[PDB]
Amino acid sequence: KVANYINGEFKEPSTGAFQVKTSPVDGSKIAEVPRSGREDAREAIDSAFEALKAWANIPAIRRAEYLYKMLEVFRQMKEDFMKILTVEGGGTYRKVWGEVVFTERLIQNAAELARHYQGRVLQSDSESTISVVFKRSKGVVGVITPWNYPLSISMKKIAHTLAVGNTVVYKPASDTPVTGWLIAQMVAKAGLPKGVFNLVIGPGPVVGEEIVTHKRVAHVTFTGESSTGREIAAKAAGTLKTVTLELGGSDPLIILDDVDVDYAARLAVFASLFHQGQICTSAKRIIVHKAVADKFIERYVHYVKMLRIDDPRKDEKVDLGPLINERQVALMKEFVDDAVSRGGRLLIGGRSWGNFFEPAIFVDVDRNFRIMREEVFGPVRPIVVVENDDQAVEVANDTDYGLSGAVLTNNVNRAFRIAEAVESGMFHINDVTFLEESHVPFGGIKASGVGREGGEWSFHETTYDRWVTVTLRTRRFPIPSAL
Amino acid sequence: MKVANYINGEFKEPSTGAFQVKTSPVDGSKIAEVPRSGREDAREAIDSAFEALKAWANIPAIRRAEYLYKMLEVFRQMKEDFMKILTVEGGGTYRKVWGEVVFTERLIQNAAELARHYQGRVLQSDSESTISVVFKRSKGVVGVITPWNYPLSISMKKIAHTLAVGNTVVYKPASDTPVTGWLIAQMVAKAGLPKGVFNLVIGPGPVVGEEIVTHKRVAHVTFTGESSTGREIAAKAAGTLKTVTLELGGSDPLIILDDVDVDYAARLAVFASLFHQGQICTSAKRIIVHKAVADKFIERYVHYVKMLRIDDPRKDEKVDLGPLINERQVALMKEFVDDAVSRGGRLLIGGRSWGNFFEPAIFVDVDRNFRIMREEVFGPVRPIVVVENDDQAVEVANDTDYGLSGAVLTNNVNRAFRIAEAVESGMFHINDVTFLEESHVPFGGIKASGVGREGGEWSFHETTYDRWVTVTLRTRRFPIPSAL
Amino acid sequence: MKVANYINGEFKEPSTGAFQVKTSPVDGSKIAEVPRSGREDAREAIDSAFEALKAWANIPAIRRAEYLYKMLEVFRQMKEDFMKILTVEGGGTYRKVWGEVVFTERLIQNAAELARHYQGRVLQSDSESTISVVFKRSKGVVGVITPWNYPLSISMKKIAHTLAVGNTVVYKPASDTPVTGWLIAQMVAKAGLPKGVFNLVIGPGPVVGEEIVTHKRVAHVTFTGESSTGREIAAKAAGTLKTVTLELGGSDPLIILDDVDVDYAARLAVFASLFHQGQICTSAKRIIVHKAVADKFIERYVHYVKMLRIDDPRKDEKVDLGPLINERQVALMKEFVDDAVSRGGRLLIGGRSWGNFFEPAIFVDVDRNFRIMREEVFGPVRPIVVVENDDQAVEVANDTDYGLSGAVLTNNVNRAFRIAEAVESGMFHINDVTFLEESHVPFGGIKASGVGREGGEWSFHETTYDRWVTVTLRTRRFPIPSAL
Amino acid sequence: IMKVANYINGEFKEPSTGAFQVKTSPVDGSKIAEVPRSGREDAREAIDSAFEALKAWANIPAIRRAEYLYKMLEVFRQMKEDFMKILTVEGGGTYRKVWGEVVFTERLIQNAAELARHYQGRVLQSDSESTISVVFKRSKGVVGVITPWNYPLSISMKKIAHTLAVGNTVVYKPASDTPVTGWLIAQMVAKAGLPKGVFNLVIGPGPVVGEEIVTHKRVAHVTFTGESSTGREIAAKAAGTLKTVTLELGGSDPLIILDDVDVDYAARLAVFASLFHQGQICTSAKRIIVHKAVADKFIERYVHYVKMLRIDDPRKDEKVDLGPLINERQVALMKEFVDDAVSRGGRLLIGGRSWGNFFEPAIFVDVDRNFRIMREEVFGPVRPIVVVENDDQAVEVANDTDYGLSGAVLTNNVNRAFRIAEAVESGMFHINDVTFLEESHVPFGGIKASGVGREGGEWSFHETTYDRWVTVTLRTRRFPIPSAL
């Protein structure tokens, strides 16, 4: 039985309302989770607001101890996190294993950096003036998270936000409440001061909107669909609260003619399809140079044929799991259908059963396919063929999304001209598009959102600069002129 | 004096053919005809900027620095015509506009100086055979919308820095200070900056400004003005997911303790609170004095306010205080004084108002419910509040929706620091005026005073983004398919 | 108790088989049999570390961090052992060595924390189509030479940080504290650091330290000890152009003005000046007080000094002072005392000594010719000097060859800051002890107190170099041959 | 129209000895000027001028020094022509070279001015409660500036401009073979109106003026560019005062050409980098390493461009490719190198003709690592080409040298490019460009025998300033002794 965590106490919703949650894998019953109203949200927010000053003006080193204790506790709960991440989220073994490991590195990173967030000492154009800039935490920070990689993304947000001295109200993804409960578990066993961190499970339209519009929330960091992020930004405007938005993207994977082709294909398969393409930074549009295009397509398709779809609980070598739910399969079917009816050649896949969806691969697409124009969050992928670098770029940019991208090539000048030219918040040469480290500035441009997360960048999102001076000389003043 | 828009490097008329007659706040004499621009004007500016962008951001930092330096020496040759339009159109005193102009010079030069030194990072990778760096790139076309109180300095702070790192600019000045904006575009024109990199559109906020805020191809909006306007700009900015810098004004605490030179405390206070008729954003709008000095202080502060010389800012250089910007400001200060009286405040001096002129109105015996404790009082009405101890000083200081700046006078290091740490503001000054400002330092508030910081590299932080870039030098194995 | 060198992951004897007996400063009892090592041994360490170097430096930084974190765990289980040996060998009281072990834990943690985070820079280029970045690289095999007063914490501050950014380490601990060194190697070896990456050679400075300082393969030397020794080391280092970090100790001013709580100032001065028998590098070795509080301060300071409890540091936890490290320290403190009395100096208490235990000796009525003004007094003999104004308080504070730290006690913000500025020292502390030090802050002196800074990222700057790397993406024409 | 003299505490004056030496043109040997021969008295008066002016100078707001440097840039802009003329006549630079140098000095002075207000300290989290913990940048002091003759104007001005920007004052001893350039710098600074004592020019022999500078008590730091022997010794003597230094000691830089390059382009670039200013650049590409597959074509095409090099009087016109070496000693040296190479079995593919101070670039193949021109810095136009079988070997040769200064690789393979870039042991590296790339604001300097420290922009600033940790404690606490209380 899952509960909210508010002011250091595990409890019901005040509305008493409850909701059943079942696995995307077999549909079997998982847990009963709260479904919370504005009362619950309001309360969590308050608890955080009152914990805020105590939490922020204690020494950084101390918050860091807390975070290391959290690392401790996490290292003990790894098993349960892998388990829930598979059962609730439909992650494969190797996927959730990765998610857990990464999460560890994340928490650690926050602890590591807390003591080192630095203001600046400044030169003055005034004489006898001492002029510095301090870093201060924003306040209560709303944390709203996706369902695909819910442990790692949640923890990046939460750990880093806590480290530099903000408190946290955290409304997990609707489709992954158990994971969020487990995080709350972890935090509570770490023994953080009551109210410093709060879990509220519930509907976005209810909990989320209180979190986003409330007077006392200083900042919101969101990860989800671009519609939701957009309106969240609009509502955040009312209270002048600042936001960090990772809105997802359709990432170009450019492959040039000088590549080892086999490798390029394996890489593409891993990047475009891992976790069923349900990655925000998944490689959602494969752009390939004409000269290698036929061999590439052959080998890509070859390894896509090798992918094993199964119950992720079966064993460690299961490649692909379910989509998170029925809606996702609906939408993926739509994408495939649209693809065929527009004249696209289905090279493979397209079968679905329950929540599972075979990777579906298309060539012969134009820019008017929905799978070119939209974020396909799931395993349906285009392969576009381009005649030169100019064209590869032009395609890679033809999209509303700015999140990430990659290029495979051995030519340094091509690697760099392409990397410079592709409009993306992140770009990787000779690697997957979803490359992520804990301390690096993760984020998009264009429709993919605003802000960066990880390390000092997360700290930048949740803190502000305070210019402070001490003026050491007496001075004469211009008014009244009579003096 | 023929005033126009500046678009794609051309001085030109609005499409509307509209004109509007701008009058001086001083005597009401006609100053000049200025455009009233429509959406079509705005869109011409924005498109011009989007097209100039790639050209502008891909040239090396150092060339944009050249342009800024040219702009700077051009400015130096325009200084006194700037001063003139400042005194006449904005109603500033000689000493005010002189200061503003000098600081504008320091600003422009600062943007130029920093342009080449905005840096990214080289990071440790957690993976072997991986190079990991972070590049700085400029956003795009940047909206610049400015106030009338310090239009030269504020607009130039925004413009020059935003330009320096490679953004182009569409700029709509305060409706009451078009001519200053025109003089700016004149400067940028004599500067030689490429066609479409800077564009001036003089028009109504509701029409021009909003196209600037809501457009597809505008990247960012930096804004200084009323908090109402700030909130709604933020709102419509969310449409295109476009970021903003927001300076919304403040109600700035000025805290005076026992141990100060009460005379010096008073002089300082008069300067900070009333300079430019208290039309500075960071003006010391809420005066907090400790009871042990409060009587002497109040006496002495009032004495120095009585000595302020209010005249036509044109007549000579010694004039202390000139007019409020327009009728509505006088009507507002009247609302403020009327409110303070009927709430039982004691009005020590001032309140006389003739035309657009207002004698500074000083009030004591106020409480937290007076409109002038609860609102930004942009003008020369000021509260004095007496407090029993430092904790009351801070409590009171913090009782406000505003976060902008604040100050404390004291010779005691522990009180200076504990108060400075305790006071919720994004800027703070120990033993100086609240409105202290430098070229390169992070200017901005918290709470309802807005979001972001400006001047120097902080301006740079607002109008650029970070782009993580990696090269991978080892081929690897991947987890899927696991049959490999 | 039989102690060895640590070389290439293996504990071993000195080649020559030579040993010498380390005896306690308390009773002169035998503590341990330690090595007396020759060039062969030094070179064996240096070579072990040079061969380890590319391997250890090329791994991802996070892996080094793992090793430092492990080292943290081992040190945590070794806390007791280190404490014991710090008291027995170093003569530190329980409280002193407890503080040292806490700060050592924090230092190891600090290094681990910062390892992954030491950043290079991405630069703007003045050249078209040029990518320009700057990488950080580890210097090489780094010689680490440490003192006896705080050997655990000082050693580990140099060692841990140097190791974090990817240098390897050859380490010669103070002659008078071989065993804490041995214990350090025990810790490292239990952390399973790669063979060769850390090395411990125990032996005479003129032989081991010499070889370290002169050897072809040592990139850097970080040293803490006497200034004479410092100048020697610097000079030798020049031979192969290896860089140095030098902490040479200071004669530190602790300045007390008239507006302090004089009792507080007294307690703080007793702490600052005499803690660990003033055998701290950054101890307050010259007390400077304003005539207004001078007499009350001297009464009160001397009162608190009399209350100081001297005893065998192994007895209990409440012992205030232990013994000086060895006979010659006493010989020297006596020389100091005699030079003070003979110069017309007034001795307020102490000067007696028994075995290696020295009773704190306080002097007033001194002048700048006194040895205890002109030299570093490393031990519990302290001057108190009375000054008229802040001016001559500074004049006295700066009159010394040394640059390390300083402190001022006052509540006046203006005096605090003008004195803090005026004092020429690498560190300064307003209203706290002269020896205040944290893991991540730039600890170092100026003048004769040495060169460099240490702790955290500054330790990283000492043991790394910057490397500019460009990729030009354009092909250009060249000025020669012109005929083309 | 004017005599050459020292600049000390605001005044141009003769040496207290009144001594002089006649300095003559490396081109025709004709008289250029009488210049001072300064003694210790002169150096000590300079150092004392600077020490005296120091607190006045460091204390003013950085913006004011920025003004000074800006004015100095204005003055330089009107002295461009004069400078170019001297760099050609006194230092034997060709027109295109000195044009280059003067332009770069402009960028240098302007860069120092741009940065002076922007050199920042830090604000740290404290592990202690109620503590304000910050780090201030303070300037070091009087700074010794000792420069070479090869690029005397731009090197001097990097050191001088940046050192002044952050609040040091300066005592400047130029290279003996380029005193008139130093004098002209003094002229610039003087007309710029820097406070007396803030800048000082002393022209004398190194073993006297230079030594007093490096050994003196009041000098804080010494930035030196020049020979490694000289460098090492300055480090040594500097150590006695504990005075920090910046040593640019020269280097023999690898230019590695791989098989995937445009060989003709590689050749053109290699000619430029190896031979510009007759190979008298510190970062000159002094050891050319080429992959066997393209080695033949490269060697042919390299020699063909080198044969196209036009050597002449640098005053005849702007198209002159190479002018003279600085002095007779230098020709002598290049002869020593050539001689050694030949009798070690080297094949002399071209050049070696030497008339007066002029030297036709001598190019060798069939070289082994024992050749003097592999093992020592060759400052002048004698160059090795060494063929290697693969990237590993190329890196092995590139690294086999006592020097670390800079390096370059030509290739289009991003992996080979990077693996080599990171493999080569040097302070600087450039992919697909000449070894001697230098910008005003980037960290210029070597490792290994090539010296210590970095220069230009904030890096210069790090060299000539120190950090000062400063703290305010806002609470009182209890202390562990006496434990009785």
Residues of chain B neighbouring D415 (CB-CB closer than 8 A): 473
Element (H, E) at D316: none
Indicate the SS3 state at residue B279: coil
Q: How far is the alpha carbon of D132 from chain A, nearest alpha carbon, in Å? A: 10
* Exposure class string for A196-211: b at 16+ Cβ within 10 A, else e: bbbbbbbebebbbbbb
Query: If we measure between CA atoms, which residue out of D194, D198, D171 comes closest to residue D182?
Result: D171
The Cα A7–Cα B402 span in angstroms is 28
Alpha helices in D347-431 (DSSP H): 372-375, 391-398, 414-423
What CA dihedral angle connects C132, C137, C139 and C142, to 10 degrees? 160
The Cα A458–Cα A452 span in angstroms is 6
Closest by Cβ to A130, choosing from C417, C457, C473? C417
Pairs across B and C, CB distance < 8 A: 77
Is the domain spanning D251-439 CATH 3.40.309.10? The answer is yes
The Cα A472–Cα A130 span in angstroms is 8
Q: Structurally, what CATH architecture does the domain formed by A249-437 represent?
A: 3-Layer(aba) Sandwich (3.40)
Our separate counts of H helices and E strands in chain D read 14, 24
**Given an 8 Å threshold on Cβ–Cβ distance, is A116 in contact with C117?**
yes
Tell me which amino acid residue D13 is: K
Residue A112 among known ligand-binding residues: no
Residue D300 CB contacts under 8 Å (≥ 6 apart), including other chains:
none
Residues in D whose CB is inside 8 Å of some CB of A read: 60-63, 116-129, 134-137, 411-415, 417, 431-432
Residue with tokens 């120091």, as numbered in its chain: D54
Q: Which CATH class is domain B250-438?
A: alpha beta
Residues of chain B neighbouring A240 (CB-CB closer than 8 A): 227, 230-231, 234, 246, 248, 447-448, 450-451
User: Which residues of D make up each annotated binding site for NADPH?
Assistant: 147, 149, 173, 176, 206, 211, 227, 230, 233
Which residues is B354 bridged to in the sheet?
A: B357
Residue C454 among known ligand-binding residues: no
Q: How far is the alpha carbon of A256 from chain C, nearest alpha carbon, in Å? A: 18
* Exposure class string for C18-27: b at 16+ Cβ within 10 A, else e: ebeebebbbe
Q: How was this structure determined?
A: X-ray
Residue with tokens 């001015």, as numbered in its chain: D113
**Given an 8 Å threshold on Cβ–Cβ distance, is A417 in contact with C117?**
no
Q: How far is the alpha carbon of C119 from chain D, nearest alpha carbon, in Å? A: 15
Tell me which amino acid residue D203 is: I
Q: How far is the alpha carbon of A328 from chain B, nearest alpha carbon, in Å? A: 22
Tell me which amino acid residue C4 is: A
Q: Which residues of D are catalytic?
A: 248, 282
The Cα C177–Cα C173 span in angstroms is 7
Binding partners of A (≥3 Cβ pairs within 8 A): B, C, D
Q: Structurally, what CATH architecture does the domain formed by A1-248+438-483 represent?
A: 3-Layer(aba) Sandwich (3.40)
**Given an 8 Å threshold on Cβ–Cβ distance, is C124 in contact with B61?**
yes
**Given an 8 Å threshold on Cβ–Cβ distance, is D442 in contact with C106?**
no
If you ran DSSP here, which 8-state letter would residue B259 be given? Answer: T
- Please indicate whether the domains covering A1-248+438-483 and A249-437 agree at the CATH topology level: no
Q: From C62, which residue of chain B is nearest by alpha-carbon distance?
A: B126
Count CB atoms within 10 A of the CB of residue A367. 10
Q: Which residues of A are catalytic?
A: 246, 280
| Measured CA distances, D192 to D75, D110, D111 (Å) | 6, 14, 16
* DSSP state string for D14-80: --TT--EEEEE-TTT--EEEEEE---HHHHHHHHHHHHHHHHHHHHS-HHHHHHHHHHHHHHHHHHH
Closest by Cβ to B412, choosing from C117, C135, C413? C413
In the 3-class helix/strand/coil scheme, how is chain A assigned residue by residue? CCCEEECCEEECCCCCCEEEEECCCCCCEEEEEECCCHHHHHHHHHHHHHHHHHHHHCCHHHHHHHHHHHHHHHHHHHHHHHHHHHHCCCCCHHHHHHHHHHHHHHHHHHHHHHCCCCEEEECCCCCCEEEEEEEEECCEEEEECCCCCHHHHHHHHHHHHHHCCCEEEEECCCCCHHHHHHHHHHHHHHCCCCCCEEECCCCHHHHHHHHHHCCCEEEEEEECCHHHHHHHHHHHCCCCCEEEEECCCCEEEEECCCCCHHHHHHHHHHHHHHHHHCCCCCEEEEEEEHHHHHHHHHHHHHHHHHCCECCCCCCCCCCECCCCCHHHHHHHHHHHHHHHHCCCEEEECCCEECCEECCEEEECCCCCCHHHHCCCCCCEEEEEEECCHHHHHHHHCCCCECCCCEEECCEHHHHHHHHHHCCCCEEEECCCCCCCCCCCCECCCECCCCCCECHHHHHHHHEEEEEEEEECCCCCCCCCCCC
The Cα B333–Cα C197 span in angstroms is 74
Q: From B436, which residue of chain A is nearest by alpha-carbon distance?
A: A469
- Which pair of tokens denotes residue D14? 């003769």
The Cα D180–Cα D152 span in angstroms is 10
Fold (topology level) of C1-249+439-484: Aldehyde Dehydrogenase; Chain A, domain 1 (3.40.605)
Residue B468 CB contacts under 8 Å (≥ 6 apart), including other chains:
A425, A426, A427, A440, A441, A442, B132, B133, B134
Residue A92 among known ligand-binding residues: no
Q: How far is the alpha carbon of B122 from chain D, nearest alpha carbon, in Å? A: 14
The Cα A46–Cα A281 span in angstroms is 35
| Measured CA distances, D122 to A270, A434, C302, C453 (Å) | 43, 34, 39, 14
Tell me which amino acid residue B52 is: A
Q: From D110, which residue of chain B is nearest by alpha-carbon distance?
A: B113
Q: From D305, which residue of chain C is nearest by alpha-carbon distance?
A: C481
Binding partners of C (≥3 Cβ pairs within 8 A): A, B, D
Indicate the SS3 state at residue B401: coil
In the 3-class helix/strand/coil scheme, how is D207-273 assigned residue by residue? HHHHHHHHHCCCEEEEEEECCHHHHHHHHHHHHCCCCEEEEECCCCEEEEECCCCCHHHHHHHHHHH
Range D354-359 contact pairs with CB under 8 angstroms and sequence separation of 24 or more = D356/D29, D356/D324, D356/D331, D357/D26, D357/D27, D357/D92, D357/D324, D357/D325, D357/D326, D357/D327, D357/D328, D357/D330, D357/D331, D358/D311, D358/D323, D358/D324, D358/D325, D359/D278, D359/D324, D359/D325, D359/D331, D359/D334
Residue A145 among known ligand-binding residues: yes
* Exposure class string for B13-44: b at 16+ Cβ within 10 A, else e: ebeeebeeebebbbeeeebbbbbbbbbebbbb
Active site residue C89: no
Domain ranges for chain B: 1-249+439-484, 250-438
Residue C335 among known ligand-binding residues: no
CA atoms within 13 A on the CB side of C282: 25
Output the furthest CA–CA distance in chain B (Å, rounded): 90
Tell me which amino acid residue D91 is: G
| Measured CA distances, B150 to B96, B181, B222, B247, C476 (Å) | 9, 11, 15, 13, 48
Residue with tokens 């969310």, as numbered in its chain: B238
Query: If we measure between CA atoms, which residue out of B467, B466, B484, B465 comes closest to residue B476?
Result: B484
The Cα D152–Cα C364 span in angstroms is 57
Closest by Cβ to A471, choosing from B106, B231, B430? B430
The Cα B22–Cα B179 span in angstroms is 9
Fold (topology level) of D1-250+440-485: Aldehyde Dehydrogenase; Chain A, domain 1 (3.40.605)
Residues of chain C neighbouring A130 (CB-CB closer than 8 A): 417
Q: From B110, which residue of chain D is nearest by alpha-carbon distance?
A: D114
Binding partners of B (≥3 Cβ pairs within 8 A): A, C, D
CA atoms within 13 A on the CB side of B437: 25
**Given an 8 Å threshold on Cβ–Cβ distance, is B62 in contact with C128?**
no
Count CB atoms within 10 A of the CB of residue D44. 18
Residue B359 among known ligand-binding residues: no
Tell me which amino acid residue D299 is: I
Alpha carbon of residue C206 to chain centroid? 20
Among residues C247, C437, C457, C462, which one is catalytic? Answer: C247
